[PDB]
Design a protein around this ligand. Structure first.
Ligand SMILES: *[C@]1(O[C@@H]2[C@@H](O)[C@@H](O)O[C@H](CO)[C@H]2O)O[C@H](CO)[C@@H](O)[C@H](O[C@H]2O[C@H](CO)[C@@H](O)[C@H](O)[C@H]2O)[C@H]1O
Ligand SMILES: *[C@]1(O[C@@H]2[C@@H](O)[C@@H](O)O[C@H](CO)[C@H]2O)O[C@H](CO)[C@@H](O)[C@H](O[C@H]2O[C@H](CO)[C@@H](O)[C@H](O)[C@H]2O)[C@H]1O
Lengths: 729, 729
């Protein structure tokens, strides 16, 4: 109440020094209930100043002057000056107007998108302020829609400057934290829009095992249910709740077989045509909803309706869950229309996520983005992207930017969904990105030609895809720990560079570069390789410090912007001196938590990593060359230590300390080996290869080696050779 | 009343199983009067089902579920599911929203359009439903504007699936059938924006006769009236009702001369500046309308005003009609503004078409499209197209698509109106299309360089244009019979392929291909010829069956999509085995109905043709090789029979039967002659011509002749040779 100020028909709540709620009420009553967006307005007390006159009020915090001159809210009556100098004259908010600087957020879907699409604003701005309008309905205490707010205007002014992480934390305090994901969500998912039988689906799952590809999730797409068998008088077979008995004669037994293989099972649900008279559950639903069965009255989709929702969860989903379905893929594409004015997609995500908690702890959905606050209902499902280099090139930027509206669990169709064109290299680059994305779900539309099975491709592509898919399971400990940090501390797994480096202009100029947890920096390659080099490339910004390629140990002295080149089988991922990354030593081994962890240490600085698990916390410390591992609880877990290049300790039990000061710090990576490899794969003249190898071996002074490559007629070859020289300086 | 259901403030009329009127009234009174669009709501009783509850109503027909949940009509309150599966999730109509699938209709005009323009929706959809909003004013019983409907929302839900012909028939039952055209409308029209005198206009008409070009209509454009002679204080000379006496010293005598030549006469009327004080009829109009003549008060155009309309028809048009003007070219381009909110173009077409019936039976106008229902006022006048290949390439698609809103008598300026560029081949291809279009009106803007006279061009173009212009008059019996079928059965002369072949995807992929009556399929060439081939081309979809080129007898086995090549003098027109096409044997002969008919029979199947005339019906039957001609009434008419290639019977009177089983079925058309001609005109190397002729003569097996042409370095030459091989298979 000390942090609440009324003036004329407005109410101002100073939630933090940098977050002010702004309300208008014609009725003099202001809204206390939660909304679709807002779950909590309880914040600790803060200091601020007021200048209140007859006709005007000014609220003053450490970061903003908010002015209200009375009357209806207009661009003239309600406005704010930030106490920052990030811009020369973009430091003022005017009610109902847009200002420059917004770093954007996300959008509902990538359905039908070939490359870039427009995004909605987020809460982050380079100029230090953003306004988030609450246009949603009020909730009841139990979380049903209650109707219109009595605050007919309800806004949140964010004035955090470039303290982006704190803005996001306080956003999560206002809108509710992201829930914890279950560990199974972080493994590889198999999905394909393909009319598998029980037999061919299990045969494929057993082929994954034979091929050494680990999976956590078995998606079954819409051909699980009747499609062509639906009489046309009912409409299409898009919506379905009845097994196709030719393909799945015993569904519970088939799901039992996936459960024996330690897979979680989800089915595609297209809800929009509801429960029509041909469906297996229709007799029960018709009885519950008092439908006219002799006129074959449909139970039309109506998620505003309590009785419909109950029948949907209990009598439609319920029997399928009893057969063993673990969680729901809500695949909604039929618009934003409802009686209530609430988006049916929001109603589905809110009510289905809540219903999923009844049968499994920390359960998920898979569904499209439903607006600010819908991060409460993971996972995000971006949908039917066009298969193209342009779509891949948009996706890292899309994924990191989404953290700016707190939606940090986007699952993209890895390799793209539909249409587009075949290029095995595009498929491989997309999988590299997916492995370093929130969720790694392989999926494809209905084409005989778009399977994401590694063995679809040639032996080189296949082996690389298998390697990356195994790496995803090696990363599950790191991902799961980051997941618990999202849930408990409001930190995104994927951060734009500018979260960590807000004052570095280069942190705003590398759209596809991101931080992946706290220990890794990713620069995916999203452009087709230069055939003369047989290598793809990306311009990488290296912050201040010593950086190592995560895979090769190639070093880079920051701060620098440097074009980096990789073969199609290799991905630019970097770790700082002192980085500690845990890996599952046994990624193929079915076990709910790893029996063995590899501690991968990057020499040259102190470091620390906290491994959060379901029932433990394990701290790895690297201080003055001493590596120490301690846990809250004891276990039989065996620890492996890799210090730079070399395995130091193999499968050691319990807590321990070891001195690595007397151990080889340097990786093997060396200029001459790397130079020989780049020249050898290049589709260039042998006389050019001979001369470059000879001259770069003979010329001793680094500045003269660089002068020699500066004369090369191949401009991209110059850049590739320059990367090696820079790493070898 | 059994087919009428009221619920809340709505009224639902089930007109057919597939056509439901949807009304809202705030006052509880619903509209029974006709509207600008709707002339008849009397339909035979149909069966349907209702589910009526406290708060909701569902109407169920064989093809649609219409739902209304009460309150104001919104996208949430009023919606419909079709009982079809043409799409996966585009089977629902939402009030006020657009869905995918609409096959489009037409637009007001092609004025100033170079190629394509956007079209309005029609009543046809690939997904099986369309909504046609009635936003017009109510009429009185006699057909004057009465003001606003009491049904403040008035919609027609069409749910015909892909039964397009039935949708159009029922549209014509709702909006009124197209009236019969007079036979004279179906012949060639001469028009040119050029300042002819009486003498030079008659000299040109006599030159047409000398050149063996038949004409039905003599258009006189705006230089008939005063133009430069109008004092500038009155504004421009665009509007005029006073003969230029230098050019037309005795108008009645000049119109008498056109009447002696068996021409119908129309004048251009630009109505928008009304009757100003310099006009010949102004003294009479001023007296009737009580104008201030000493202040030279204009009788401004006001078609909302009963007295203005009367003075316009009786005192302005009346004297010109007494001089012999047969019908009015209404040339309105001055906007959609009126006191009433009724488009002045609609007021002109409605009232002028009605007034034209006073002096001639089945009279016409010539005017732009005035919205749904304005098919009641033929003919359509598309206006000032840009002269270009792009404009020609749009026009067949434009013409057939218009049938989807029932506007089936579009008259285009043949050869294009204005601007654009000279290409004698474009002029010739445009005339080919015009001859197989609803109306063949040659017209051109004010340029010394754009006359459509055949003898404007070189001897090759001239002779081809004369041949096509004579063909149009040969087709008048077929056109006039189709005209009576439009008027009596609601079948368009020009149909998109998908009317006949709604389930064939290829019927939606050949935009410029159409059915022309029931016996002919047209694929106009609308792209400049390939100079290497000296031939133009179009990809033709041949439906199942045996097809013949109408002109050459070249055969084609359906179903196939095949690129076809024609010299600039030849047009792709096709007839099925069993086709019977009547032709006027004496197209140059002035006679109100043909004294001789050629029955052109395509061998290989049974067929039938009904020739409807002013005062007769003649049935031609081809059954098990027996051709029979019978008529309702006897006449002196002499019948000629052409069976494939050969004239069997010459000028035989009365009813008769003849056996053609013992007569040569095969056309002369042959691979070797056609191959020699294509190679001979081609601007390619003689060594290539020599080798193709030699190899295609020597190689006996059809598959190896195709393999030989597959090696040709000229890709289009491959396609041309492949067409011949396919026809010769
Ligand atoms: C894609 O699906 C279409 C189907 O609609 C149908 O036409 O069959 C086609 C194959 O011949 C198939 O390509 O396109 C639609 C329209 O854009 C999408 O809605 C589909 O994506 C969604 O549904 C899929 C099936 O459940 C699912 O795998 C996707 O993840 C969904 O986004 C798309 O596959
Ligand atoms: C064309 O007419 C213009 C005239 O407006 C005037 O400027 O003289 C020009 C020649 O030097 C002439 O080209 O352009 C206008 C504006 O777009 C159209 O309205 C004219 O078309 C209509 O009027 C014509 C004359 O009656 C008629 O032949 C057309 O059929 C009408 O559409 C167009 O000719």
């Amino acid at each position: 109440n000390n942090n609440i100020i009324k003036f004329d028909k407005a109410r101002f709540t100073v939630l933090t020094e940098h977050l002010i709620r702004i309300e208008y009420s014609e009725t003099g009553e202001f809204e206390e209930r939660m909304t679709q967006m807002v779950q909590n307005r309880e914040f600790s007390e803060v200091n601020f100043d007021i200048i209140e006159k007859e006709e005007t009020i000014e609220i003053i915090t450490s970061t903003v002057h908010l002015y209200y001159n009375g009357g209806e809210f207009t661009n003239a009556s309600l406005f704010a000056d930030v106490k920052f100098n990030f811009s020369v004259y973009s430091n003022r908010w005017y009610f109902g107007e847009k200002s420059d600087g917004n770093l954007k957020g996300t959008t509902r879907t990538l359905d039908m998108i070939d490359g870039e699409c427009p995004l909605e604003d987020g809460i982050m701005s380079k100029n230090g302020f953003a306004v988030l309008a609450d246009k949603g309905k009020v909730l009841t205490e139990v979380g049903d829609i209650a109707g219109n707010s009595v605050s007919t205007i309800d806004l949140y002014l964010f004035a955090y400057g470039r303290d982006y992480r704190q803005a996001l934390k306080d956003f999560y305090q206002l809108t509710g934290n992201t829930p914890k994901l279950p560990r199974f969500a972080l493994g590889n998912w198999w999905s394909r829009y393909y009319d598998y039988s029980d037999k061919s689906y299990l045969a494929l799952m057993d082929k994954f095992t034979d091929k050494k590809v680990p999976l956590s999730v078995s998606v079954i797409d819409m051909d699980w249910h009747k499609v062509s068998e639906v009489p046309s008088r009912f409409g299409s077979g898009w919506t379905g709740y009845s097994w196709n008995k030719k393909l799945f004669p015993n569904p519970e037994n088939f799901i039992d077989e996936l459960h024996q293989r330690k897979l979680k099972v989800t089915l595609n649900d297209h809800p929009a045509d509801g429960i029509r008279a041909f469906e297996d559950p229709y007799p029960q639903v018709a009885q519950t909803l008092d439908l006219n069965t002799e006129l074959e009255e449909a139970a039309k989709f109506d998620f505003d309706n309590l009785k419909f929702r109950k029948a949907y969860f209990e009598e439609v989903h319920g029997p399928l869950e009893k057969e063993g379905v673990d969680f729901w893929w809500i695949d909604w594409q039929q618009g934003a229309i409802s009686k209530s004015g609430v988006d049916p997609l929001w109603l589905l995500n809110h009510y289905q996520y809540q219903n999923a908690q009844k049968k499994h702890k920390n359960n998920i959905i898979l569904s499209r983005y439903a607006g600010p606050g819908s991060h409460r209902y993971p996972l995000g499902f971006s949908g039917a992207s066009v298969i193209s280099w342009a779509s891949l090139d948009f996706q890292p930027y899309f994924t990191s930017t989404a953290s700016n509206i707190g939606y940090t669990w986007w699952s993209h169709d890895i390799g793209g969904h539909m249409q587009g064109y075949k290029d095995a290299e595009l498929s491989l680059r997309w999988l590299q990105f997916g492995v370093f994305s929130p969720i790694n779900r392989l999926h494809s539309s209905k084409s005989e030609f778009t399977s994401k099975e590694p063995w679809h491709f040639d032996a080189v592509i296949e082996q690389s895809m298998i390697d990356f898919l195994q790496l995803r399971h090696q990363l599950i400990p790191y991902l799961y720990s980051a997941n618990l940090i999202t849930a408990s501390e409001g930190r995104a797994l994927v951060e734009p560079l500018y979260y960590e480096y807000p004052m570095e202009e280069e942190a705003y100029q590398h759209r596809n570069q991101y931080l992946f947890g706290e220990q890794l920096m990713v620069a995916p390659i999203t452009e087709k390789m230069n055939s003369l080099l047989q290598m793809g490339s990306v311009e990488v910004w290296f912050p201040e410090g010593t950086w190592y390629d995560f895979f090769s140990g190639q070093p880079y002295d920051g701060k620098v912007s440097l074009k980096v080149y990789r073969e199609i089988t290799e991905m630019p991922v970097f770790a700082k001196a002192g980085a500690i990354i845990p890996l599952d030593k046994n990624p193929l081994k079915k076990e709910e938590i790893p029996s063995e962890i590899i501690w991968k240490i990057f020499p040259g600085a102190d470091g620390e990593y906290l491994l959060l698990e379901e029932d433990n916390e394990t701290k790895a410390e690297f201080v003055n060359g001493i590596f120490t591992v301690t846990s809250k609880k004891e276990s039989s877990r065996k620890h492996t230590i890799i210090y730079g290049e070399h395995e130091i300790v193999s499968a050691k039990r319990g807590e321990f300390s070891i001195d690595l000061n007397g151990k080889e710090e340097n990786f093997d990576w060396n200029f001459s080996t790397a130079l020989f490899r780049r020249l050898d794969i290049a589709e260039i003249s042998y006389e050019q290869k001979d001369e470059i190898l000879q001259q770069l071996s003979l010329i001793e002074e680094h500045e003269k080696q660089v002068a020699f490559i500066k004369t090369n007629e191949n401009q991209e070859l110059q850049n590739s050779l320059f990367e090696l020289l820079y790493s070898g300086k």
